[PDB]
Ligand binder design. Sequence first.
Ligand SMILES: Nc1nc2c(ncn2[C@@H]2O[C@H](COP(=O)(O)OP(=O)(O)OP(=O)(O)O)[C@@H](O)[C@H]2O)c(=O)[nH]1
Ligand SMILES: Nc1ncnc2c1ncn2[C@@H]1O[C@H](COP(=O)(O)OP(=O)(O)CP(=O)(O)O)[C@@H](O)[C@H]1O
Ligand SMILES: Nc1nc2c(ncn2[C@@H]2O[C@H](COP(=O)(O)OP(=O)(O)O)[C@@H](O)[C@H]2O)c(=O)[nH]1
Ligand SMILES: COc1ccc(-c2[nH]nc3c2-c2cc(OC)c(OC)c(OC)c2CC3)cc1
Ligand SMILES: [Ca+2]
Ligand SMILES: [Ca+2]
Ligand SMILES: [Mg+2]
Ligand SMILES: [Mg+2]
Lengths: 317, 438, 424, 60
Amino acid sequence: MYTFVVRDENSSVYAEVSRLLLATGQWKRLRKDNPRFNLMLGERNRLPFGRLGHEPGLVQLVNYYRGADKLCRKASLVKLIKTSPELSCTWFPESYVIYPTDEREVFLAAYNGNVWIAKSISSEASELLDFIHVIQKYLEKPLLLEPGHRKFDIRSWVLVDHLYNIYLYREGVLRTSSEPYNSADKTCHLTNHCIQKEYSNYGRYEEGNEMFFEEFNQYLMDALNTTLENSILLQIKHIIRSCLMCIEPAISTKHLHYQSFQLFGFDFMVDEELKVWLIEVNGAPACAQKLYAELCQGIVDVAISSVFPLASIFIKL
Amino acid sequence: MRECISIHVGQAGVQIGNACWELYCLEHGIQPDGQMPSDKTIGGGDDSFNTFFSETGAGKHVPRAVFVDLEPTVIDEVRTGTYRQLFHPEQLITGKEDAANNYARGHYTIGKEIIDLVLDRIRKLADQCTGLQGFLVFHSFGGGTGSGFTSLLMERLSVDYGKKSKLEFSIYPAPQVSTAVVEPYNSILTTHTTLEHSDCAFMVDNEAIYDICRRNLDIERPTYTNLNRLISQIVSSITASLRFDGALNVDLTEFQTNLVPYPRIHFPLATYAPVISAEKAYHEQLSVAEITNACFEPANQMVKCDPRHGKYMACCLLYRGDVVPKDVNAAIATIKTKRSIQFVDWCPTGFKVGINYQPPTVVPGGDLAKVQRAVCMLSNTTAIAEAWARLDHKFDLMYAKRAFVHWYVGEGMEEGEFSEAREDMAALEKDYEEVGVD
Amino acid sequence: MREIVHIQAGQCGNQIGAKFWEVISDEHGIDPTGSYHGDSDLQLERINVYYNEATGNKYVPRAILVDLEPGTMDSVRSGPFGQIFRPDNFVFGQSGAGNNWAKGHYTEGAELVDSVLDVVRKESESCDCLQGFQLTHSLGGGTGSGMGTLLISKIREEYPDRIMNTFSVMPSPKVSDTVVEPYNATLSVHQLVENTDETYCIDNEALYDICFRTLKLTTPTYGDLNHLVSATMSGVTTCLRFPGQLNADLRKLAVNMVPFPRLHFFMPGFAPLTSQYRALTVPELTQQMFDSKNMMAACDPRHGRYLTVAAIFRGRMSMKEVDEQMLNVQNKNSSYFVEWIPNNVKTAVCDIPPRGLKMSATFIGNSTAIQELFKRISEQFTAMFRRKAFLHWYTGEGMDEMEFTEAESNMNDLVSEYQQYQDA
Amino acid sequence: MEVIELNKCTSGQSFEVILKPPSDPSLEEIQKKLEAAEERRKYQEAELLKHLAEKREHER
Ligand SMILES: Nc1nc2c(ncn2[C@@H]2O[C@H](COP(=O)(O)OP(=O)(O)OP(=O)(O)O)[C@@H](O)[C@H]2O)c(=O)[nH]1
Ligand SMILES: Nc1ncnc2c1ncn2[C@@H]1O[C@H](COP(=O)(O)OP(=O)(O)CP(=O)(O)O)[C@@H](O)[C@H]1O
Ligand SMILES: Nc1nc2c(ncn2[C@@H]2O[C@H](COP(=O)(O)OP(=O)(O)O)[C@@H](O)[C@H]2O)c(=O)[nH]1
Ligand SMILES: COc1ccc(-c2[nH]nc3c2-c2cc(OC)c(OC)c(OC)c2CC3)cc1
Ligand SMILES: [Ca+2]
Ligand SMILES: [Ca+2]
Ligand SMILES: [Mg+2]
Ligand SMILES: [Mg+2]
């Protein structure tokens, strides 16, 4: 008989697994501050990792990896790809880090196109720094898909259990900015639910803009004579293996007193050579509505009940 | 030669004292009657083992130690145990009724009846020191005596010997052993009162030693005898440099300067390997690199925490046994790659290393197998603040309802000393966070 | 060397006191003549806590027998181990207290109390280091209830820094001498809140039910009830009488059991309940002792929360299994322990079991559901006191109605103090 | 990886490897605090004997 607290309430994904756990008659939600729990569904940040693994007779596990922010904030992220030997790296955009660490002449030697993207968009290396924060290069020519000239964006969901098996969810989502896309005018330059759920027509050339994988593969075959696996997913699996295995000796809970799993959202981009690029690693990712049921259950099989037995949908990397 | 006087306070301090001094005897070949056949300078000596032993005309080697408990029951076993002759009646000190797991009762109430007598018993030993360098105080965080009386003695030892260094071995409380529900109270109270008075304090979490004693010794429940006999090994390696020919950590002032850049952050994490069961009869003896590697597994640390998520400020390696320097830099070369080992920007990434060739002594018929080579690592890592956060939380939970506070007020203390001591620990937690993250 | 002075007071006090001393004198190898004939010497390590040394070093209890009639006390001393008790330690008046708190506390008891404090003084002067007193008594009669709390008022005065600790039997309509019992008991509880450090609440309701429902005794006698009490009392005190990793004394016990000084009424439980050839397995010991059916106080632990708990297992058994099972009962039922007292459950084990049982487990619970008991006694009290019924028995001895409402008040408060920590 | 200050002897050796370099209360004041604890103790004991004495008055 298993216990678990919930300490992140508005966690879209984990709200659902908290549902599924109770709905097996073998898991009980205690109050946030009850210490005698089997499983923490911890808070986004300031998660008190130092207080796990200290309750006698309790196998404790939490849905977060201490140290994984180093992959998940672009400050630490960028830093990781230059500092670490295991990352040389031909799939991350060239990058630096500015404060209103710190080294800035870095940004000069490369300036002879020269367009970059402002957030943490312009071609002028001056109006940007008025923000006074990471600020880097915009793929002036992406892959652009049709019928309708829709510039898109790929999210993959990766699960990492207590054993550090890397699990790619087979269902990715493709969040398209299904409208045109021009030059210089800062609307389709940004493709998700932050400038298109407020500023930017919320699903023109299909259902809510949102291509899932079966369709995008069929398009790729018909539109390009290739498959999603070969053109992109190989590169995606390579990116995921490479990030998570860089930081493994720093966040592995193999021989420590508690244990961690965590679900990540990877956000990629493509160009026309079907080169895949990595933008951001999300440490607290929300799922795509149609997929919540299947992903949230797969979390339980592989990350939760693998450690707490009772009475595939993932590709192991 | 500069002498070191040891002070074992309370049930934990005294019982660990027995484990250490018995080990000291086995190590320096001193017998249960104080005779040291290998000792040729009869009744005198400037040898480094004389740092911990004075001598008598009859050749008796007698600890430079004072045992003090607010209650006779434990120290009595010293008075009638195998090493009764080792000690002088005057250096084992007992009160009538103990501090009943109450900091305020051991510090304030029963404190003053014994403090002037015990400092006098200390002056007896201090006076046969030609160059005393300070004291090593052993005590629990949790007991009323261990916490309350030690923080009173640490106040006076500062005033009576302000030019002397004070090193602590403190037992941090853990429910898998442990007693009072109010040990979080005694813990916060006593470190807040002892902080500015201690130069270097080795915390030993009973939880860590328990787990070690269970995994690596296949001992279902471990006894105090198990725990203490292992704590003795770690203490022995920490102290060995004062009792033996050496060049690293040869005085107590060296522990401060080698391990403690700021006086407030004077709690080095200790990691020790290997711990091998004496009933694991066929055993593959581990290499230098294997045992230096284990110094970075959390499961060998005297306090369970994750040094991977903080910075270092000093690393000390102490090897006992078949160790040569080449094997050490080869293991350090490997481990620097494999492992996240991030020092503070303003400190050298580096290890002060010491080797004694006499391998560890194990108590005949004890639980630890004797190993060909052993290491003990003293690292000043900011990840030890995890143990404060744990302690301070348990303290917050109770003190928000004032649970058990009345037992302390009833002894003269005031709720204010509670929240004063908790703000000190809040500051000690901020200190560790400054040094440790960006 | 940490002695207790034991005082039994009144009919119920001295009947329960009597069995307790035969129960544990059997446990310590002492025969009805006071002579030791045991095997081990663990039987004799903490012996000094309850027995003074004697003739050819026999053992006399450190017990004082107190009553306002001689009847029960003649019965004790003509009973089994009645010879072991120091005859000088039989302090008794003749008139009785008529089931009347006021006679025990103010008139009849007032006359006798000085003679008792002379015996407590000579028993306690012979103490290298006395730690406290334990009093046995009911709260529904006159002598144990009214005089007993007077004695505590006085002992506290002469010995203000010793622990005062009582075993207190609560009246219940199911097992009742008289109708004034809720009066006598409301007045005793007002005293106990102020002048004791720990009180084990032995409810006569619960002892009846255990006897009827569990032990299957169709009509239980007082001896059947005191069988359960002398076993719980042996249980509750085994740490004080036998050596262990636990250095258990009354003050350390109170320090860890009592978070708030008024909230010091404990719910004892025992397992197995016997009146048997398969020893219970440790998983059953711990399931039983935490079952409401094994509590001595007739409150449902699931109706409140445990501020603190102290359990002890007797016998030779798997020290790891009691660890495991103890730790497991906490998580099956963590809803019923307070989140704000970390590690509030503490467990000891003794290798020596009680007579006849190879494995036994005794439980001591500071639960906020003990409130049910005082709520119960308070309802009964008010039921009569609103019509000022039976009060003449008390106003006839000097008491005023005011003293009664104060005692009603202090106990309704104690009930509020217990409810507020059930909600935290 | 640089080695420093190696000292040998009969007992063994000591040294330092480097992998990269950088980039009090007086007694009379505790006399006060400590006796100021003994007085609130005895205030508490007085106020106790005071209530006991009131209880004798009522008893009488
Ligand atoms: N490692 C170890 N811990 C001990 C030992 N004895 C007691 N402890 C721990 O110390 C705490 C209890 O403190 P004690 O040393 O027994 O207390 P004390 O100093 O005797 O003070 P009082 O008995 O209250 O007067 C608990 O956390 C115990 O787990 C021991 O021999 N070895
Ligand atoms: N190198 C690049 N080239 C072109 N477009 C880019 C780009 N990097 C990001 N974008 C665009 O920025 C929008 C995605 O924003 P992003 O994922 O960085 O969210 P964010 O900055 O708010 C971090 P968080 O999710 O934690 O709040 C994308 O449609 C996308 O096209
Ligand atoms: N459990 C138990 N309860 C008793 C015993 N004798 C009396 N009582 C209860 O004690 C209360 C009466 O008090 P009692 O001890 O007879 O009067 P006292 O002599 O004036 O103290 C009533 O509630 C009885 O139920 C006994 O031997 N065992
Ligand atoms: C809730 O947490 C705690 C509870 C009790 C203690 C303690 N300290 N010292 C002792 C005790 C103690 C415990 C006893 O039960 C385990 C105990 O038996 C009845 C018992 O016998 C009366 C004692 C007396 C000896 C400590 C912590
Ligand atoms: Ca000599
Ligand atoms: Ca009369
Ligand atoms: Mg003690
Ligand atoms: Mg009667």
